[model samples]
Target: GPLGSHHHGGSMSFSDQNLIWIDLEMTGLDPEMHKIIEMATIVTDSELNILAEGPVIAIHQPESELAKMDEWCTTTHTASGLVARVRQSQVSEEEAIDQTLAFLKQWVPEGKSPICGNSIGQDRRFLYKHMPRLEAYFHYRYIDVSTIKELTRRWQPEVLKEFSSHLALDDIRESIAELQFYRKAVFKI
Candidate 1:
């Protein structure tokens, strides 16, 4: 979802016909301590139907010597659980990123393309920092659904208070659900 573009007044959409959701698992927050432990992605069309999905690529961390897990991090993603499973399932970071990008490019409709994510900035930054070679494929334009959520909160305060936080896929589902509400209520589309 890092390739979507924004428009004026906070409105945004993908010019490309396809959308993909990517998530990563890491050792810890520190770039020094952190290494990509796993990656997963799901591809969908503009209408949000699953077109294809890549396997969850896990990467082993023989150098992950530290007890990397922390309570606060666990509250968010639970990296510890993932690390345990990583031994049985692993792939090199370069190979994983390359394969995912290649699969997306091949599967997406031929033409301009856009990717979407709940928070593309963090995802993009992480990838660029780790997989610098893949940086070229990291498009700068993206629709930050978080911004749309903020707009919704200003317009409809009560709904924002009820929303949950921190979980990745859940946050994404909430954003899509809220987008439908905004489209119906405001745009009436």
Candidate 2:
């Protein structure tokens, strides 16, 4: 089947869709110690079209508590700056995880759109820590955006561009160009 928008049984799957891109900003790098301050994801079809967008809503430790955390490496743990931002719109952990699970269930076995991200291994650790039951719903596997970059350099050998903002949703959007490269290479479309 050619890749593009897909409609079936009065519903749309957008056949071109493939991966669920995710990113997170957290209080610290170590999942055991820190907390996720913010999270965002983009739902894209095979060609990287935006199908949906949402942020993870979760209860966060009070700013008073975060201030008491040990020394932080600002370079990796930028969440120190996210405190005020989250307080404006935080939800209970139970509700947040419930909503996330509901959304994730939508593109499950059908999309198999493994969560994609840059050095996603880090993000997953945080997700697994706070989400509690995340393991039950998500596949342990995910797409690595870094691998896409490496392959592009190995195969194309053209030019490399830096494309990460360190911001959750923005970073997801920036990676799309590279993602499309992988898609194009795989499907030869």
Candidate 3:
């Protein structure tokens, strides 16, 4: 399946399954120039039960090589501060991705379930840019809650009013809430 379709409502059995929310922080918006500074994700079952929380894995880069910190980026996530802290902290890029993928694999059974995220575009882009081979583990499948929101708006226009953006964890929380509301109103399941 394509990247977007993997998360379509009817594509998988959301009930009794696990959902993984992923978020990534990069040095700059341009993937070619910027690098991943941090990554975090949370796993929740279909019943909205918390399965496991991935650590906020920080990747340290030399301060001399750090890109110019963007003030706007700090407004949502303290990327600048994160870079400073990470420089003083430990954990390499390979280690962070390895640990995060390991945590995700625990709940994502082979060829059984799919991972869900707020906007697979951003997170998926970051992962593909870095962990190109890791794509195989997920079978190149993922669900984007953003598309689910689009489907909701088309069916029930009023549902679009509840959507919000920005902040890594908050966006995931809002997406989960919106998904629940959508399923209740549209599918009645």
Candidate 4:
């Protein structure tokens, strides 16, 4: 690690309208075998605060998917832990996906748009499986803040900070914060 050690290879940033974030917590890694128990999408203003018309969104079922829940998933995320949260969720899977797709249109820059978040490709895998034509709603592009974190903790330790490290929404917000910071620094603002 060295001062001014460049990351992302060179400068890169998503366009204004392309700035959307999403995270999904699912039954398991393999989308075909699992389902998403929770999903979060964030639409931020240029200032990176929640948009007025389109607030950050969270969605899931109101009770156990046990007829459908995973026996186990990640070391940190448990089956019970997922239900405890999903039972508390207010949005159905169908509603969340369609609504999120509609909401994404509100801020699309132009052409196909991309979304940002942690390891979003993983989210993408589950999402495309559960929601047909979901990929049609977006471009293939992604903003990977997980890479940023890895790069930060490795080469730019000075920029690292404490984080929840798991919650989808919080993770997206942190990614936005880092994107904002780097945007400023990259432009020497």
Candidate 5:
């Protein structure tokens, strides 16, 4: 199928469209110096139905490069076994981006799909820095759940959803769940 808004037609409400939810675990925060060692993308419908689970990839990197991570990242990646996984991964950074782009093509129309997640603009920066092809697939708009959390925290502080994991997929699932909770609260559905 050709990639464009034609697939969706007209008059579909924003909430009725599919979403590309992405999460990336990098060597560091700064996209310029860091690289995405691990990443995942989940495609879902408006109701949050899991249309696709992942093209989850742990990118291959040298131990020397992995070792250069800050103390916090080193400790967390070690505890999470991500450092070991990256070392063993057969996928290079380039390959990972290609596979992710291929996966997105199935559900994401070029320059139409809005990437969503908690604090996802940071993820966008990394994508543009390292995976320009993949980054170009998304629309400029961001559906950031963190923005909702900021507003809700001030007004409805009691409806809290805690995220205790740092894994890419887990963080995305938590973000979706948290957004769903907020949607329920706000829409009274």
Candidate 6:
């Protein structure tokens, strides 16, 4: 607990925990009213090393369901080609959840890990609503990088800037990279 202390020599420490980084593209923010259109999960060690990348599942939704998206959601997804993919994708909500669980079991113990990402609580809520089984697979605790993001914005101002591609996979990658930057800059390790 001393200042400037490090854990590099430990063979088994908290850093050994696996982190399940997830990102979901939904039709809207309200999990009760909206639908998840796509999902991506990536597993990493506490050191930020890549463990595995789960399938990027484009969930299928009927035209009516997709049509319910707000204008901003519609325009963003449309420009990203996700809107068309959502219609054509054969993967269903159940299938998406099953695949995510199966993938997690391969790298995580008991199919559970702390979810990590920017504004990740939103993704967690969507999972709880639409994919209850998969949501339960995650530990109750989570790592929200958005907190550090805001701190950096206030304290360092120009230290980090994120450009979102509005896609699940790219967004997760950006989140991971942003956290890595903070670790080096703020921690001064």
Among the numbered candidates, top TM-score falls to 6
Model 5 gets an lDDT of 0.81
Question: What does each candidate score in C-alpha RMSD?
Answer: 6.9, 7.3, 5.8, 8.7, 5.9, 6.9
Worst ten in a row by lDDT for model 1: 6-15
Q: Give the lDDT ranking, best first.
A: 6, 5, 3, 2, 4, 1
Sorted on TM-score, best first, the list reads 6, 5, 3, 2, 1, 4
Off by over 4 Å in 3: 1-17, 68-71, 79-81, 110-112, 162-170
Q: How many residue pairs collide in each prediction?
A: 5, 4, 1, 0, 0, 0
Which of candidates 4 and 6 is the stronger one according to TM-score?
6
State in Å the error of residue 44, model 3: 2.4
- What's the lDDT for residue 55 in model 2? 61
* Per-model TM-score versus the true fold: 0.68, 0.70, 0.72, 0.67, 0.86, 0.87
Would you list the clashing residue pairs of candidate 1?
1-115, 1-116, 1-117, 4-142, 58-90
Kindly list the per-residue Cα lDDT of model 3 for residues 26-127, writing each as its tens digit.
Answer: 666766666777777777777666666777766787764464546665444453456566687688778886787676666765444455667677766766
Regions of candidate 2 where Cα sits further than 4 Å from its true position: 1-11, 14-17, 56-59, 68-81, 109-111, 150-158, 162-164, 181-189
Query: Superposing every Cα of model 2 onto the true structure, what RMSD results?
Result: 7.3
* lDDT tens readout by residue for model 5, 1-189: 345564333112323267889999999898877888889988888777678777778889887778679999999988998888898899988899888877766765777768899979899999999999888888777899999888877877676543225788888888888778878785457
Q: State the local distance difference test value for candidate 1.
A: 0.58
lDDT of 5 at 86: 90
What is candidate 2's lDDT per residue for 12-88, written digit by digit as tens? Answer: 66332356777777667788777766676667775577776766443466776466445653443335445555566
Expressed as tens digits, the lDDT of each residue in 65-95 for candidate 4 is 4345444454445523555566666776777
- Model 4 misplaced regions, further than 4 Å: 1-16, 45-82, 88-91, 109-111, 161-165, 184-189
